C-alpha cells in the first residue's frame, strides 16, 4: 500500500507543479521536483518555497526568476539574485520571512538588488579616491619678461 502511496506522490508531484509544462520546466531547470508552500515572492520574480517537513538544510529553497535587470537567466543562474531582505531567510540565519516582518526601510538602501557584475561592463574598477598631493608650480603665462 505504501508503494502505490509514493507512486501517487509522484502523480501529485506532476499535477501540483503546473501540470506537465511546469514539471518539465523545474525538472530541466530547477533540477528538482519537490513542491513546497509559497512562502513569498519578491519584486524580482524569484519564487520561494518552504517545506518544514524535510530534513534540515532542505526546508527553505528558491526557484530563481527568468528575468533580472535585462540579464535573462531562465537557464543559467547563480547565488546572487537573492535580495538582501530574503538572503538571510534563504540561508536560515533566521526563521522569519521578510513578509511577516519587513526590515526597517530607510532612504539610502538600494531599490534594485544587483549581482556579481564581474565580466559584464558594469564591473568595478579600482581607482584613486584621493586628490593630488604635490601640484606643480604652473609656468608663467606671460612671454619672456
Amino acid at each position: 500500500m505504501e508503494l502505490v502511496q509514493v507512486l501517487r506522490r509522484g502523480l501529485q508531484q506532476v499535477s501540483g507543479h503546473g501540470g506537465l509544462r511546469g514539471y518539465l520546466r523545474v525538472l530541466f531547470r530547477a533540477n528538482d521536483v519537490r513542491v513546497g508552500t509559497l512562502v513569498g515572492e519578491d519584486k524580482y520574480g524569484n519564487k520561494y518555497y518552504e517545506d518544514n517537513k524535510q530534513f534540515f538544510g532542505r526546508h527553505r529553497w528558491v526557484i530563481y526568476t527568468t528575468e533580472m535587470n535585462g540579464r535573462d537567466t531562465f537557464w543559467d543562474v547563480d547565488g546572487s539574485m537573492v535580495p538582501p531582505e530574503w538572503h538571510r531567510w534563504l540561508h536560515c540565519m533566521t526563521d522569519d520571512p521578510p513578509t511577516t516582518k519587513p526590515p526597517t526601510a530607510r532612504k539610502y538602501i538600494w531599490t534594485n538588488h544587483k549581482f556579481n557584475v564581474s565580466g559584464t561592463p558594469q564591473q568595478y574598477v579600482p581607482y584613486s579616491t584621493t586628490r593630488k598631493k604635490i601640484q606643480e608650480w604652473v609656468p608663467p603665462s606671460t612671454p619672456y619678461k
Partner: protein
C-alpha cells in the same frame, strides 16, 4: 586511568576456531562492510541544491566588508584608524581630511581582501560599528583588481547590503 586497546587472545575452542576458519574461508566480516554499505546506499543523500538551495548560516558570520551609515544617512566611520591598527594583514589603508562640515570620514578607505584574512577584527575594533563583516559570502570575481574595494564600494556595499546586517547586529549586539 587508561584503557588497553589492542590485545584479545582468541579462544582455541573448536566452536571458536571454526568461527575464525569460517570467517576466513567464507568472507563474513569482509561482507559485513559490504553489507552495511548497502544499507547506507538506501539513505537519501544529504546534498543541497546550489544555488537554488544554500547551507545553514548564523548571524555572526564573516563575509564581505560593507561600510554602513547612520539612519540619517551619515556614514558611521569617523577615521579613528583602529581597524587599520588591528588589521592583522594591514588590508586597511586610511587617509582623512576635514572637508567642510560634520562629514570628515576618509580621504581613502581601501580594504584589500586578497590581503585581508577575514578575521573580523575590524568589526569589533570599530567604536561606532562602521566597518562590519557582511553576511554575503558570495562576492567572487574574475580579475585581481576586482578583489580589492575602494572606499566608495564599501559605501555601496553597505548601501546594497543594509537590511541583513542591520538585523544581524540587532540580534547580536548583546553577545559582543
Amino acid at each position: 586511568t587508561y584503557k588497553f586497546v589492542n590485545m584479545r587472545e582468541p579462544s582455541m575452542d573448536m566452536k571458536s576456531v571454526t568461527d575464525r576458519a569460517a570467517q576466513t574461508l567464507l568472507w563474513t566480516e569482509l561482507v559485513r562492510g559490504l553489507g552495511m554499505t548497502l544499507s547506507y546506499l538506501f539513505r537519501e543523500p544529504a546534498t543541497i541544491n546550489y544555488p537554488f538551495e544554500k547551507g545553514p548560516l548564523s548571524p555572526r558570520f564573516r563575509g564581505e566588508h560593507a561600510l554602513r551609515r547612520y539612519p540619517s544617512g551619515e556614514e558611521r566611520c569617523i577615521a579613528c584608524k583602529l581597524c587599520e591598527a588591528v588589521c592583522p594583514a594591514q588590508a586597511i589603508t586610511i587617509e582623512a581630511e576635514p572637508r567642510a562640515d560634520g562629514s570628515r570620514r576618509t580621504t581613502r578607505y581601501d580594504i584589500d581582501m586578497t590581503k585581508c584574512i577575514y578575521c573580523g577584527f575590524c568589526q569589533e575594533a570599530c567604536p561606532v560599528d562602521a566597518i562590519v563583516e557582511g553576511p554575503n559570502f558570495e562576492f567572487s570575481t574574475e580579475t585581481h583588481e576586482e578583489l580589492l574595494y575602494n572606499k566608495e564600494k564599501l559605501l555601496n556595499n553597505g548601501d546594497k547590503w543594509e537590511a541583513e546586517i542591520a538585523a544581524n547586529i540587532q540580534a547580536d549586539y548583546l553577545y559582543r
